[PDB]
């Protein structure tokens, strides 16, 4: 809305908040990111360390679909089980089955304490996750 802007508060004041000594002029420092090495060096070096240079190897035709690999944690595993099966679950008997690749995940990581034993089907798994789930009472089955 134009009625809330600062220019409506400034009608009658000649300079509009820019001063009589240093006026409001077109481009007093250059256009764009000009001068990042000469006269804007302090700004660049103190707020954006690492802007200039090269690092690492190249990869000419990157495709992200072969690189798809999302992750989920043991203490988060309960989002993928329905409430009734979670209540019915108990170590030593019949456990719920979780399909990570159908739920949208690829790798199982092992942070935290597992809140319910279950059988997990995953493409990948880590050492700690495998060990912890085996101790809890569930199991992990590799899929493709």
């Amino acid at each position: 809305p134009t009625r809330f802007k600062k220019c409506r508060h400034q009608r009658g004041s000649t300079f509009c908040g820019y001063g009589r000594v240093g006026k409001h002029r077109k481009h007093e420092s250059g256009r764009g990111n000009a001068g990042g090495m000469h006269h804007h060096r302090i700004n660049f070096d103190k707020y954006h360390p690492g802007y200039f240079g090269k690092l690492g190897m190249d990869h000419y035709h990157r495709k992200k679909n072969p690189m798809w690999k999302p992750t989920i944690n043991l203490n988060n595993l309960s989002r993928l089980i329905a409430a009734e099966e979670a209540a019915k679950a108990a170590k030593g008997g019949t456990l719920p089955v979780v399909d990570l690749q159908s739920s949208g995940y690829a790798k199982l990581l092992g942070n935290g304490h597992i809140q319910v034993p279950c059988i997990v089907k995953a493409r990948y798994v880590s050492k700690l996750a495998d060990k912890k789930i085996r101790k809890a009472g569930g199991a992990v089955v590799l899929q493709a």
Binding site: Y47, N65, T94, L95, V97, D130, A139
Partner: protein
């Protein structure tokens, strides 16, 4: 006095804006509801004209290609000649009785071929000739942990299989 802002990359340094000297390069969407209405009206008219034939022809079911979409299914372009032969149909006759045909597809495994043959047979059963969704595999039911599953870990198997290819040759 530029403080702590991002470094901008707004990319607007060609003559896209129409002014007294420039024609511009812009595209607005102010005809969106009108065009949507027109499309719907055309579809209703076409269905009325081609009645009693269905408006959209029969299509197969295929798997999505990459490793990110491996687990999903959608509609394909047309049925392959192997599937048509296994259903006992001529391609040129199927094209007239309302089935889409695609002679480029390959049929590299038996499961997809079975699914499409079943689709064709259902359609042929339900079709009447005047004289002149996709299916996902079923979820697994709850079970119990076995002795081997309790005893051994799968991480070592995964890692050894990865190392075989990584350091093979």
């Amino acid at each position: 006095p530029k403080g702590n802002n991002a470094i901008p990359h707004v990319h607007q340094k060609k003559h896209w804006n129409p002014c007294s000297s420039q024609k511009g390069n812009v595209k607005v969407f102010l005809n969106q509801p009108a065009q949507k209405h027109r499309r719907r009206r055309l579809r209703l008219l076409k269905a009325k004209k081609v009645f009693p034939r269905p408006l959209k022809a029969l299509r197969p079911q295929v798997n999505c290609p990459t490793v990110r979409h491996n687990m999903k299914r959608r509609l394909g372009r047309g049925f392959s000649p192997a599937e048509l032969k296994a259903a006992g149909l001529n391609p040129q006759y199927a094209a007239t009785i309302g089935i889409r045909v695609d002679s480029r597809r390959k049929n590299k495994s038996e499961e997809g071929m079975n699914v499409n043959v079943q689709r064709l047979k259902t359609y042929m059963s339900k079709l009447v000739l005047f004289p002149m969704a996709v299916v996902y595999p079923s979820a697994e039911a709850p079970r119990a942990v076995s002795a081997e599953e309790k005893s051994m870990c799968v991480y070592a198997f995964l890692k050894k299989n990865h190392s075989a290819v990584r350091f093979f040759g």
